[PDB]
Write a protein that binds this ligand. Sequence first.
Ligand code: FUC
Ligand code: FUC
Ligand code: FUC
Ligand code: FUC
Ligand code: FUL
Ligand code: FUL
Lengths: 87, 88, 88
Amino acid sequence: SVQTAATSWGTVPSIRVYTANNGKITERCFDGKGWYTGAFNEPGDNVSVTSWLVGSAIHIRVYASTGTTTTEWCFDGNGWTKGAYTA
Amino acid sequence: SVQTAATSWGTVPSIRVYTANNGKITERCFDGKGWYTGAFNEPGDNVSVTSWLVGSAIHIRVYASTGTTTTEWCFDGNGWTKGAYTAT
Amino acid sequence: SVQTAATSWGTVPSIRVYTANNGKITERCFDGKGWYTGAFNEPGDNVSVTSWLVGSAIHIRVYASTGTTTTEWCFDGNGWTKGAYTAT
Ligand SMILES: C[C@@H]1O[C@@H](O)[C@@H](O)[C@H](O)[C@@H]1O
Ligand SMILES: C[C@@H]1O[C@@H](O)[C@@H](O)[C@H](O)[C@@H]1O
Ligand SMILES: C[C@@H]1O[C@@H](O)[C@@H](O)[C@H](O)[C@@H]1O
Ligand SMILES: C[C@@H]1O[C@@H](O)[C@@H](O)[C@H](O)[C@@H]1O
Ligand SMILES: C[C@@H]1O[C@H](O)[C@@H](O)[C@H](O)[C@@H]1O
Ligand SMILES: C[C@@H]1O[C@H](O)[C@@H](O)[C@H](O)[C@@H]1O
């Protein structure tokens, strides 16, 4: 059974949904029209997400877990990079 | 055994908690007094949730998963309807 | 295999991550300069979280599930106390 996590910002709105399926996490996006595929693609059997705005600029943190190892992924306006989070 | 998801809005606050137990997702609600049962009741083994405020009016999106099938459910003031969401 | 839940607030920015591991939930904290361990430490196999501001002060509700039993934990400025939440 697949496992998901969701966040949203604004009032249009913008929505991001992350799905862990047979060890891989992918991203689906909504910005007021239809759903499309996002840039996020990394390993994980489990996922959680949060987001915040600084003025009108979006920041997303994805917590991806394989066994007992959790990796933080960071969106800050220019692709995804690894964050400093440890357990 | 059971899996939950939670969202909140305003300063009172209002809270909604969704629980996947025994093949069904059910909803519990708080608006400043006690907890009561909500209208949401649909099939699922896994659940996630997000929400946004339009003035004082809440909008809720619930993502219900069984196997490789994820169904989006939509609250916009007048009950729950299925959404256009599909996976990659 | 571990399960996590996350919440954030403000422009510090502030983040809280909860991890369920072998029936225990722990908390890691970010407030602008490195991660540290937080006060929350209670039983659970499954975890969800939500939070809201009153002025600039954070309030957090953590939903900790062991089997079919869900307990709500409450932060309102000074330590964690059990909440009134029960399931359908
Ligand atoms: C906010 C961003 O929106 C699109 O650019 C996606 O491709 C990214 O992964 C991210 O979700
Ligand atoms: C808000 C911060 O963004 C990056 O600096 C990450 O490396 C940190 O772990 C944190 O998520
Ligand atoms: C908002 C608070 O921040 C720190 O004091 C943590 O130790 C608490 O558990 C709580 O997360
Ligand atoms: C916002 C409220 O805070 C405390 O009163 C809890 O006992 C309730 O369950 C609710 O979470
Ligand atoms: C915001 C709405 O509150 C109502 O009382 C509930 O019955 C709906 O399901 C929804 O949560
Ligand atoms: C915000 C949008 O609401 C619509 O009713 C849904 O069908 C879309 O999938 C999306 O959630």
